[PDB]
């Protein structure tokens, strides 16, 4: 239609004021021309930030695919418009959308080497393992196009995400394999979680053993001060508690609240762990940020068989 063409033209031109008048007129936000291009596509490739904000407020299909399969995120990531990428993803943009050739927005950013864009794409869960039509991952495009650093960074981001998913699931053979291929055992996600954190919490004994021998920091602290020993106490994995303690796990390590692994073991109700913790020198007198001993937590939860052993002091 005519009004359709007006909005597409106004988007390419970047006339912020002209769009608002066009939106008040009820102009279809998802109107597409012959090529399937929408006003949101053009504003992204053009680089107009203010228009994208308004178009999304009016319910523009952020995952609209043109005849080639490109989406607004393809162009914004391709043309290096970081502000556009950041806002597009915030509004639910498909971070792993693929065009007719199987190329994700990460493939494009790796070709041109926009580091700052690749980081935000990875942070939002970009499939670095995604394969294009030509059997090339974004890491492959980073190397052929000469961006070797982003290739390394892409390689790293692949292994950590693969490694953490290997520990969480509980595949021993795979964890051993990835470390052979340069997987960083001390790799931590946005959450500060390491493969050891998940191997302990999830209860996979053999995986915990492997990671530790590869230099896994047993006292690794996530953003809440938690340690694999804290997680092993809450979950109640006795063998894991002993293993961590034998490899130098700080038995009086404190999370942000001040809980030791002893507080937590008394919280969930895992007696056998309380004994091992004390056997390895757990300060029974230690209090949390609110002055609560592991004893006070035991009586509050109504598991006095714990308090009885803590009454021993």
């Amino acid at each position: 239609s005519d009004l359709g063409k007006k909005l597409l033209e106004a988007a390419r031109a970047g006339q912020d004021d002209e769009v608002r008048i066009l939106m008040a007129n009820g102009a279809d936000v998802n109107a597409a021309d012959n090529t399937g291009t929408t006003p949101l596509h053009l504003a992204a490739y053009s680089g107009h930030l203010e228009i994208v904000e308004v178009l999304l407020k009016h319910g523009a299909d952020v995952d609209a695919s043109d005849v080639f399969g490109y989406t607004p995120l393809h162009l914004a990531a391709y043309w290096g418009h970081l502000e556009i990428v950041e806002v597009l993803l915030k509004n639910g943009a498909d971070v792993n959308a693929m065009d007719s050739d199987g190329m994700t927005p990460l493939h494009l950013a790796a070709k041109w080497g926009y580091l700052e864009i690749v980081e935000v794409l990875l942070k939002h869960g970009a499939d670095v393992n995604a394969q294009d039509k030509f059997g090339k991952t974004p890491y492959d495009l980073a190397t052929d196009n000469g961006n070797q650093w982003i290739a390394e960074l892409l390689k790293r981001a692949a292994l950590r995400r693969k490694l953490l998913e290997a520990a969480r699931a509980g595949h021993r053979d795979e964890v051993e394999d990835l470390i052979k291929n340069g997987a960083d055992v001390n790799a931590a996600d946005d959450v500060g979680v390491t493969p050891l954190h998940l191997a302990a919490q999830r209860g996979h004994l053999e995986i915990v053993e492997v990671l530790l021998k590869c230099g896994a920091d047993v006292n690794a602290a996530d953003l809440w001060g938690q340690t694999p020993l804290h997680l092993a106490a809450t979950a109640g994995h006795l063998e894991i508690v002993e293993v961590l303690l034998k490899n130098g796990a700080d038995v009086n390590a404190r999370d942000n609240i001040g809980h030791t692994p002893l507080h937590l073991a008394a919280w969930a109700g895992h007696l056998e762990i309380v004994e091992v913790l004390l056997k390895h020198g757990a300060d029974v007198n230690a209090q949390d940020k609110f002055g609560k001993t592991p004893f006070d937590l035991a009586i509050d939860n109504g598991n006095e068989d714990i308090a009885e052993v803590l009454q021993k002091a």
Binding site: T35, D66, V67, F68, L75, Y78, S100
Partner: protein
Amino acid sequence: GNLVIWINGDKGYNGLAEVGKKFEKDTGIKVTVEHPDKLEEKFPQVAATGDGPDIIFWAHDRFGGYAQSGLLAEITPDKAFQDKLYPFTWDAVRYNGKLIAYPIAVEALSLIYNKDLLPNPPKTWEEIPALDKELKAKGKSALMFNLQEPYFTWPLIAADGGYAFKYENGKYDIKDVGVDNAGAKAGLTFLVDLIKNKHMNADTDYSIAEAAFNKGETAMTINGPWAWSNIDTSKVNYGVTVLPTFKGQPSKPFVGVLSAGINAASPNKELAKEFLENYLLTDEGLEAVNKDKPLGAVALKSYEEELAKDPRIAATMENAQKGEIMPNIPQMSAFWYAVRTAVINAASGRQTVDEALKDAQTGSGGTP
């Protein structure tokens, strides 16, 4: 004793008459220089078994049809004269291993760029995407050329190994077609990317490409020697250089060689052979017709080197030597239709590249 010659109006017929009138002064045989419309489609029927012009001027792509019927006389120049012209020019007039005509001028697309916006043009096709953002920063595009017709896009597709019909010793293998090989795919894929990447627009045609570069809106374009008169009217400080290289290979644009064929039913053929050989194909002879209407790049070297002073002409010659001759066989008519639909669909996303090319390979009577 008469000489009737035909030549299109847009070509230099006034200067040709000066050479013809000078020929009348030495042989006493009249030389009529006439420019009638529809001279190409009317020749094969009027003169097959009737009176027709003794000499004809037109692109070689048509002599393939005339030679199929045998309406043009076989010409045989001595080795001394064959060496005056560029070697590759005879291949345009070569049919079934035989020579049909005298090549006069050569035309082939060349890279035309705006020196003001871009003093140093790109030498490789891979440089445009990066350059496009740098120019798009100032509101101007890098490259813009006709995409509807395959004749304008072909040099990039054929750069890496694409070919219409294999040319071997003056004969095309009609069964073998080369619009499906990796070279055409590798090339066209890059073309589609530029459109997919918003570097160009699928709807781009001849007019807006000319208007865009003529108005200074874009910094580069691809066109033949015919658009020069319109650019200099636009007063754009334009230049001409070799087409950029893709995959290390040079772009292969189709070459059109304006040739001069002799009618089979002519009462004076030996004396007519002398006119073309000794009077038209000389510095003074070609200069006369060149003053009327320019011929661009010429087949005769001694006058090309004099025209090589102009880099715009010498540039066209550089592409011609690297480009591919346009086949004169009639099967090209199906080649254009089949290839035109491929670029249009792949450019508009209506069909994938591989699907578009394979449909064109068969459409041109080829086997994948």
